[PDB]
Amino acid sequence: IAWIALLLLVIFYVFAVMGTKLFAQSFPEWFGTLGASMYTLFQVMTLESWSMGIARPVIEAYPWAWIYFVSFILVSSFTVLNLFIGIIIESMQEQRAHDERLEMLQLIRDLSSKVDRLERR
Amino acid sequence: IAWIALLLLVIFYVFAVMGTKLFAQSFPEWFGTLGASMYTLFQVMTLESWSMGIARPVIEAYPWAWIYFVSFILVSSFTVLNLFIGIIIESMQEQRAHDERLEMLQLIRDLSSKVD
Amino acid sequence: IAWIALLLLVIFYVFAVMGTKLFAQSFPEWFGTLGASMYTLFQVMTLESWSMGIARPVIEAYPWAWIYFVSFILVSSFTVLNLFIGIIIESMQEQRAHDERLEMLQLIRDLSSKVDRLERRSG
Amino acid sequence: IAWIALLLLVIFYVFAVMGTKLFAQSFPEWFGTLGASMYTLFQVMTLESWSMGIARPVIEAYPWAWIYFVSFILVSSFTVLNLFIGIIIESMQEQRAHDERLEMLQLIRDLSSKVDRLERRSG
Ligand SMILES: [Ca+2]
């Protein structure tokens, strides 16, 4: 589970600062600082007015961003789907048989040499 | 399952009355009484126009609410995720191999003690 | 699974015609006929502008409806949650190892009798 | 899992070009080219302002689109539900131990023949 939440809370951080690089000059509403690039991306993440409210409007300026928004969403929904489903899995549902065998082998090397040793005789 | 729905339907109640303390000064639309602080939070909970419709606007006035909304949502989605997943779990839900080998070993010590 | 989709596609039908009784007076946009009471409820079901777009506005007129919308949503999301989860359940819910071993045993009863042979008939 | 993502990323492609046939006359905002028929459908797929923002407005012109939007959504949500649930299934519900045993067997055929190799050593 929470071995993905590090990935995610860097993705969040990663994308945010591109958006703050790109947009703050013309959408300081949403992207002037991390302080709301987070909010924004949090909201984008959430799928309330991501396109019509944020993106379509971002894109009237920068078609550069078309993907920023589609990309972020796919990834965001995946790396949550991935973590979300890693709590149905890691909530609901072998090397004491390498230790069984890899001495059961040492038991047959012991026998094959305690037979080979009973051979010279 | 429903041992969480008590927690949830207090969280709902909890957050609502802060919001009615805070906002039902300047957003009596949404937060003047519980009567729509519930609705509002229900809608916030639901993620239809939570930010753009409610929060961003709440926050144009009070930036201390910034978190109220983000906090509520995280918790809300969790304590539903927790209860939701407590109905996949609370709806749905060997030594033979070791025995086969750990006497197959005792069979080869038996054989290897075939000695003079 | 589909023993609930009858319940659901009656709930849909049920609620719609109350809404068409109630509202297709004053919200014939959304509730004038089933033809968009369905759409509307489908959209309400979907949680795009259910409140701000449909309900808060329905309710400026009829506070009667406050619940219509909250009630429908709870039930709707449930009787889908119920059917949705009835396709994780009604979709979902070590032999070669016992054939490896249970002749590897027959190989060692073979050896312990191919030695019971020849220690004994050697010396 | 990804044997459905081909179906889906054709459904996406399929519907888009009907929408571009139909609408990129009168809704070139959303449907003038694939370049935003995709976006649009992506956004429709996502359920942000699909009805109120896109469809209800598409349909003020063409009521034959009524279904285009309801149909796409049902299918879209299904063929994602189908693929989504194909990663709970194909995630939830051992050949360095067929190489352990199937030479540990070849070790006991070796021994049973290096014992039967003083069995032929009486004859
Ligand atoms: Ca929405």
TrEMBL record, chains C, D:
Transmembrane spans: 1-18, 30-53, 65-89
Keyword Transmembrane helix: yes
Lineage per the UniProt record: Bacteria, Pseudomonadati, Pseudomonadota, Gammaproteobacteria, Chromatiales
GO cellular component annotations of the record: voltage-gated sodium channel complex
Predominant cellular place of this UniProt entry's protein: membrane
Gene Ontology molecular-function annotations: identical protein binding; metal ion binding; voltage-gated sodium channel activity
Record-listed Ca(2+) binding positions: E29, E60
Protein name: Ion transport protein
Origin species: Alkalilimnicola ehrlichii (strain ATCC BAA-1101 / DSM 17681 / MLHE-1)
UniProt keyword terms in alphabetical order: Calcium, Membrane, Metal-binding, Transmembrane, Transmembrane helix
Subcellular location: Membrane
